[PDB]
Design a protein around this ligand. Structure first.
Ligand SMILES: Nc1ncnc2c1ncn2[C@@H]1O[C@H](COP(=O)(O)O)[C@@H](O)[C@H]1O
Ligand SMILES: Nc1ncnc2c1ncn2[C@@H]1O[C@H](COP(=O)(O)O)[C@@H](O)[C@H]1O
Ligand SMILES: Nc1ncnc2c1ncn2[C@@H]1O[C@H](COP(=O)(O)O)[C@@H](O)[C@H]1O
Ligand SMILES: Nc1ncnc2c1ncn2[C@@H]1O[C@H](COP(=O)(O)O)[C@@H](O)[C@H]1O
Ligand SMILES: O=P(O)(O)OC[C@H]1O[C@H](O)[C@H](O)[C@@H]1O
Ligand SMILES: O=P(O)(O)OC[C@H]1O[C@H](O)[C@H](O)[C@@H]1O
Ligand SMILES: O=P(O)(O)OC[C@H]1O[C@H](O)[C@H](O)[C@@H]1O
Ligand SMILES: O=P(O)(O)OC[C@H]1O[C@H](O)[C@H](O)[C@@H]1O
Ligand SMILES: [Mg+2]
Lengths: 417, 423, 420, 418
């Protein structure tokens, strides 16, 4: 009876347990023995056969038969990475061989799969075969457009519900919420939350023409939306911001981001973008009876119980991983393109630019992105050319139609219309 | 004056109806259109009385629709009253639409609603009114490119998943078997989706039965062998999800037995009233006679009326907003007698004649593809006796012993089930 | 060694069972006690074979229970097996408890579980073992001070409200009447709670019927009058919630009509089987004959088992944690054959004798309380004054397509059938 | 036809629509005409009766028959305080008389009720209802203000997700629960979700708190968890710890700077980030041990969640009791529920003599409920500090001697109640 070894690396995503139970349940039906390494590679890195034994468990039918309802991961996860030093990988090989592992499945992000292949490449193919199931809550893998990664549906739906309450609260007690969606990689999650909840505005790094952002431009994009809605008798709303704006700002923009101060280094995590915009917008707009409050959606999504779409999705990835093992595949990533859970070789998907896996961003030319824009509140190219509109909007700001055009009309060159 | 967009909903409600209404109305309002909404579908348009229709038409304004994307149901209600099979009724709808100066006419409903919409258009100048329909089914039975859902389906399946979740915890905490009947006889998409997501131990849908007709006995025994196999592993509990469509695939011998060894009730037109069937209840009643003495409890449970007006999940909120936008886009581009659908992430108008099945003159019905990879994966995790399973003497020994019968008795009673359903 | 604490669950599950288990276990481990849990209640303690019991007992360690307060149901499962009817079985239970050196025996369950625990205790020494039971009922029918809830009732009521909420939107979007049957015949706390919270138009609990036996005709007419009054205001839809206990209060003639003018079902021993009674289904078919010509659709809906194992809401999470703590404190203070309950914000042991009047005194809805009166105001119903309002009776009668004389003679007697 | 005028004051709480629907629907049956003032006292305080009439609506059956399902308020709310100045009450009296409203119903918390009393001194009866998610109105013991159950329940669900994440990917979450008046909400969320630590101002003995003590209280819990093999957890902090802090503590809290202040000299505690500051300090002290720490705010997403069944029933009965108090001629009272009965309680009985405004009900840290909640927390008790064996294990977890651990932490037993 061969041995299967599963582990999780990187941040958790809803439905992580779904993959573990999908692979384990099918493997047990074949008669395999399944084990799970706690906290990813953290203890395989030490190379101590008994420190590892104290941190691996039997993945039995009883353990996994009902985890498909539950978020997080029963075998935990960690960012521990054996790929960064020649000693660590050998410690991994020493423990896999000592554990008589035959099939090796990892569930994790771009940095987690690379560890799997590197440890595998220094091992005989007849003794160990490696498979990985890439995971990401930011929906940034290069699957065919409109196709989502597992966990993304759960994250977007819970985020919609959180913004729903902020939408009702912003109207009931007039204010503006600046909701910062966690995740600097792409803009899929911020735009999905905003469009589903009817958020009045969404800013993502992908909608900016210039290769760097200026702090003042982001202030004016939000300031224009607040002015236009105020011009229609509404002093409240919700604006959603992808954190990826941070990783695109310029050096000067980052300096203003931290309060006109030099930023720390080894550091965009310490950045507080929604909070910084709230302070600047309050100096400019507070006199108009406008309250602004930042709010961060984020960590609370990572271990939400999977929605039905991600339950089916992850189970089919678990079966697929075992199926790739049976069909002899190795060094491949389990993906579902066009409704087929097929093994895909990491070479065929690794974009040569960054070395890591190709990251699919939001297509702001697609119609889907255009539809989201129609239901937002923003001054378009045509809007600035409407004298009657510009008159009311500038009046709402207690500025003249002229000063308003000086300040804000340039924004049509910062963001794709 | 400004062009008038009239909106109605037909058929049974599904999550996201308001989302379609808000997408069409908000976009139209930005274009300066006047948006009105007829209450209860074609109900009053069929009368032909202009005043009555005015008494059941409301002005769809910004503040009314600005926040209904959060809410299930339809703020303009819905009806199934349809004028398609009445030349007089079709004219009556035309007279009321002309009276209200309706330039763009949008219907949100199922097959009957869309067919009625085009029939109203067959006798109207193509430059005075355009007709667009937005297909709606929680049953997911539209012939969209497979694996792509219809709006409302994701919401119904997710809520359906959470109900069965509580039934799975309850069935294990207090050992019991639940027969969950998923309302709707169109297809098995809802049953299989809820069962696969919730990890139910069995899902029976009409698509997997090879015979053109189904026998009540074969359904009893398919569930029975699943229960026995579970019993052979120390587990006297589980959940089985039956698609209601099994009833409409049964033979008349199965119907008489289903209705209590009696005569199926019928309306005053000669049609069997299948809504009065109690599939899940009848099968648990029979299954208790056979397996009850093995310390097995069985309980029916229906799901599906509570699903139809659940608040839409994010996938449906985005979906229906894009559909409502697409309806207005079709109006602008000049399309008419077209249905707004989303294929490959693109909302496009598709002519109604192009969706007809030439054999029936009816829009095609997409059922579960039981030869798909997805369905095979679902079956892998179900608890059932497969073909090669019946050939394992050790396994049939354990299962037969669980049922307090001999191995030869088990093969006699249950081995024919591999020829009843696709393996 | 260290004291052994055995825990089991008996009967129907309710939200928060895991809360009581976790509250008792976590505190017990803080005291150094060993904690064990019996799968499926007394089912295996009845067999007597100790090795079988060991195969169905688990060590309740810190990591087993530290996070089950989120989870509904019970990890140690439950069963209706009760050794209270066989000292052959009670001796078997005592035998396995002694083998496992159970110093403290905490059972969570209903009447059969509670009484079964004390009878086993009666045949043992008061120093070797001590027994405490935590009463459990999702029906809120324990005799606590008025308005104070049993654990799990909040969770069940809130989930039921959500289901009716979907039914209310559906009934209005696609005009229809839903007859929501709230399962449970013990009392009407669940039905009234769900209906009041959800804005349901009518609620019928057996507590409001003045007479001792209920007639099938009268129940039909109480729903009928509400539907007609709604029709008289342009509303041809609504939700009416029926407590399943209406079946248990019906007269012999009423039962005969309820099952379809056939002999009521019965078990092999001759006792009536009310579980086969589809109360909402029968009332829908009957009300369809009478009101179908008016354009009224009526569909039944059952809200039962999906409540039992819903995840506990915050009120019940705090509740059952305080209960579990109180059970350990009762063991420490030397209490035995006692029930752990909470009254006026304090968890405390309460001897069996305090609450018992055969099974425990069933607390029913107080239909004379101000709480029930307020619920009635927001219902749609023909009060005694409504029947005497000539103008109103004309509108309702016309909605039902009958003369005011016919309406008054048929429906006006209902003022003496249910509390005014 | 008598006129009922309804407004909402203060921050929203789930069930406001329940009160409005219960009061409006009953008043409709009595034949009353019902109206609603937008944004609460914002425009009744102005005295411009022309502006007031613009932002008023007629509360009809269609408007309110189904809002009992919905959180938020259909008539909005503001924090405007007519009790601030003598005519701030006068403008309200003038506008109310102009509209000829017989019955005036305010739906708000401690600040709103005091405003209602400031106007109830002159034809027009005034009744309030107990709105607050902070559970800090002086209702009978063990009896909650409406909206508190819903806010606690949704807060528990949010923390549950943070609990699964803190264990799946070992991390510590510092949850800051909104509300500076009392610790009810923070304690309810933490107890129900099984959070490892909770800190509320009610448990500190001295009336001024030091930043160092707050940091060390979390530090002791994190170290103790490490001693027992766990490098993760969740800690809930009532944000009212900032309002109990000393001037020196506030200086450290705002990054060793003078706290921001309003044009009147009072301190702007809204700009404070308690959880963020503690996280930064604790990461400096414990990151080497393998401890990751992350702050999270909860509370703006709680104010307008759809009410739970408890608040739906509660607000339906409170709204009924408001019309019943009006029907009985009562005035200058707040509707309360005790033993399942709604009754008016005069504002005079609820006023604290020193403040002059409605009395704030804090958590009773001497009660059994609080003691039990503490038993399930991970903390160092007075006895634990006297356990030489336990102290050695925690100190080793913190990479320090037992002597150093006792010097730094043992004094905490005099900082908070045991
Ligand atoms: N940026 C915007 N996004 C969405 N709706 C808008 C926007 N600006 C105006 N509207 C609405 O579009 C409709 C027509 O606007 P108008 O033609 O300016 O009266 C009204 O309901 C406006 O409130
Ligand atoms: N019908 C079934 N569906 C899913 N899993 C099953 C089924 N029958 C057995 N198993 C499980 O498959 C694994 C291997 O089965 P066996 O080798 O027969 O013990 C065990 O975990 C069984 O419980
Ligand atoms: N049975 C009832 N329950 C609750 N509200 C009612 C009932 N009957 C009438 N109403 C409402 O009471 C108000 C006064 O009605 P009326 O007495 O007809 O003027 C209106 O909002 C009616 O819809
Ligand atoms: N401060 C605390 N709060 C809650 N549980 C604790 C605390 N300290 C220890 N425990 C647990 O209580 C039990 C007693 O452990 P010990 O004191 O080592 O015998 C073990 O399960 C510990 O993990
Ligand atoms: O806040 P309201 O004016 O009511 O509604 C604002 C709308 O604009 C937002 O993008 C959403 O699509 C909403 O429907
Ligand atoms: O825990 P049990 O009820 O034994 O088994 C549950 C699993 O069996 C079912 O087919 C699903 O695949 C679940 O994952
Ligand atoms: O909207 P409708 O169905 O007409 O009325 C709903 C109300 O009537 C019900 O008794 C409850 O009191 C609800 O508030
Ligand atoms: O699973 P762990 O995080 O170790 O412990 C969680 C428990 O510890 C906390 O104080 C609560 O009482 C929880 O029940
Ligand atoms: Mg206050």
């Amino acid at each position: 009876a061969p041995v299967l070894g599963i582990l999780c690396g990187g941040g958790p995503a809803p439905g992580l347990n779904g993959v573990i139970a999908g692979a384990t349940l099918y493997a047990l039906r074949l008669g395999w023995k399944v084990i799970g390494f706690m906290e990813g590679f953290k203890y395989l890195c030490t190379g101590d056969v008994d420190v590892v034994k104290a941190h691996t468990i039997d993945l039995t039918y009883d353990i996994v038969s009902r985890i498909h309802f539950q978020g997080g991961t029963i075998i935990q996860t960690s960012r521990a990475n054996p790929r960064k030093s020649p000693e660590l990988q050998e410690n991994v090989r020493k423990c896999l061989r000592a554990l008589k592992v035959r099939y090796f499945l990892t569930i994790g992000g771009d940095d987690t799969a690379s560890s799997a292949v590197s440890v595998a490449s220094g091992m005989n193919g007849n003794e160990i075969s490696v498979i990985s199931c890439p995971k990401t809550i930011d929906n940034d893998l290069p699957l065919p457009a409109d196709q989502s990664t597992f966990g993304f549906h759960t994250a977007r739906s819970l985020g919609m519900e959180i913004i729903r309450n902020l939408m009702v609260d912003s109207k009931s007690a007039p204010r503006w919420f600046l909701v910062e969606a966690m995740g600097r990689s792409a803009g899929h999650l911020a735009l999905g939350m905003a469009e589903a909840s009817g958020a009045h505005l969404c800013l993502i790094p992908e909608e900016f023409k210039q290769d760097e952002i200026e702090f003042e431009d982001v202030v004016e994009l939000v300031e224009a939306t607040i002015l236009k809605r105020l011009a229609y008798g509404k002093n409240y709303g919700v604006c959603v911001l992808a954190e990826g704006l941070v990783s695109k700002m310029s050096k000067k923009a980052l300096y203003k981001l931290f309060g006109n101060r030099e930023p720390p280094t080894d550091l965009l995590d310490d950045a507080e973008l929604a909070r910084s915009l709230s302070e600047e917008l309050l100096k400019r707009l507070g006199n108009l009876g406008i309250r602004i409050t930042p709010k961060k959606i984020g960590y609370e999504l990572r271990c939400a119980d999977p929605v039905a779409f991600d339950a089916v999705y992850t189970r089919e990835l678990g079966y697929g991983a075992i199926d790739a093992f049976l069909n002899g595949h190795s060094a491949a990533l389990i993906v579902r393109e066009n409704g087929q859970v097929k093994p895909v070789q990491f070479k065929d998907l690794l974009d040569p630019a960054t070395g890591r896996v190709r990251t699919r961003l939001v297509d702001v030319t697609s119609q889907s992105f255009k539809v989201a824009r129609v239901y937002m509140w923003r001054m378009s190219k045509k809007d600035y050319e409407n004298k009657d509109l510009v008159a009311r909007v500038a009046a709402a700001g207690k500025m003249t139609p002229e000063a308003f055009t000086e300040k804000f009309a340039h924004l049509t060159d910062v963001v794709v219309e």
